[PDB]
């Protein structure tokens, strides 16, 4: 249901990120583990402290996954086919956790992009993140 205005806002907002994707992904992950501790059950025996290379490593992976999703906004189901299969049959993360990570991504973008986080871009990014979560949960059942 992504509108052409949404694609323009998401591309412009994520375009300002650029090389800061790996740092923003690690920040949004730490925000999720702190605000929603129930999400930590999916990363057992992981180093979840601040400045952890384990957290910073996975933060770049999710960021590169979102970077590929923005470039393939019109081909999102086929671009995230490897991740949708992994999250559905291997990780089996409950779909309620996707809303928690999507919310922390919006908070990270708002805190880091003060000029680009307009109410129009805010609504566009929330719809885009909801579409990515729906794609990653489409192959669950």
């Amino acid at each position: 249901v992504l509108s052409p205005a949404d694609k323009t806002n998401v591309k412009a907002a994520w375009g300002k990120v650029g090389a800061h994707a790996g740092e923003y992904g690690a920040e949004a992950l730490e925000r999720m583990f702190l605000s929603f501790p129930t999400t930590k059950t999916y990363f057992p025996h992981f180093d979840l402290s601040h400045g952890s290379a384990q957290v910073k490593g996975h933060g770049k992976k999710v960021a590169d996954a979102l970077t590929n999703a923005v470039a393939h906004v019109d081909d999102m189901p086929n671009a995230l086919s490897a991740l949708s299969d992994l999250h559905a049959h291997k990780l089996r993360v409950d779909p309620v956790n996707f809303k928690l990570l999507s919310h922390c991504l919006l908070v990270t973008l708002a805190a880091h992009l003060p000029a680009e986080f307009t109410p129009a871009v805010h609504a566009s990014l929330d719809k885009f993140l909801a579409s990515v979560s729906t794609v990653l949960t489409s192959k669950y059942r």
Binding site: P37, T38, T41, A88, L91, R92, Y140, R141
Partner: protein, 145 residues
């Protein structure tokens, strides 16, 4: 908090519930309707087909134990957090179970009680049981950190 009439209606129905067989039905239907909850039972065998889940013997054993602790919580409806305090710490610190699975299991159990009792599972009885499964799910997630 439940009213005496609500506590009596929930207790009366449980007096007719066979914890052994019903436990294996709720856990089985939970793994079938929501297949992402199978990540904790890889050692149980094969759970690819519904008949395999409802036919798994290890699933029926865990279902009786799960609903067995649920049966003990019904006798202490005024203190579910303290009753499930030890189980909440184990599911979190040792089992790493997502507390959302407690809400999915509560939804399945309401459907199992309706499928087994039929017209006896009246809308007022369901509303009384909706608060029970919500309290047990929150009590089992209270000790999560």
């Amino acid at each position: 908090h439940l009213t005496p009439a609500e506590k009596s209606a929930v207790t009366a129905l449980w007096g007719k519930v066979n914890v052994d067989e019903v436990g294996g039905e709720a856990l089985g239907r939970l793994l079938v309707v929501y297949p992402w909850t199978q990540r904790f039972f890889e050692s149980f065998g094969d759970l690819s087909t519904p008949d395999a889940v409802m036919g798994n013997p290890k699933v029926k054993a865990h279902g009786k134990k799960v609903l067995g602790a649920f049966s003990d919580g019904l006798a202490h409806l005024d203190n579910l957090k303290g009753t499930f305090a030890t189980l909440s710490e184990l599911h979190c610190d040792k089992l790493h179970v997502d507390p959302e699975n407690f809400r999915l299991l509560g939804n399945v159990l309401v459907c199992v009680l309706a499928h087994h009792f039929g017209k006896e599972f009246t809308p007022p009885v369901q509303a009384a049981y909706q608060k029970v499964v919500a309290g047990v799910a929150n009590a089992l997630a209270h000790k999560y950190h």
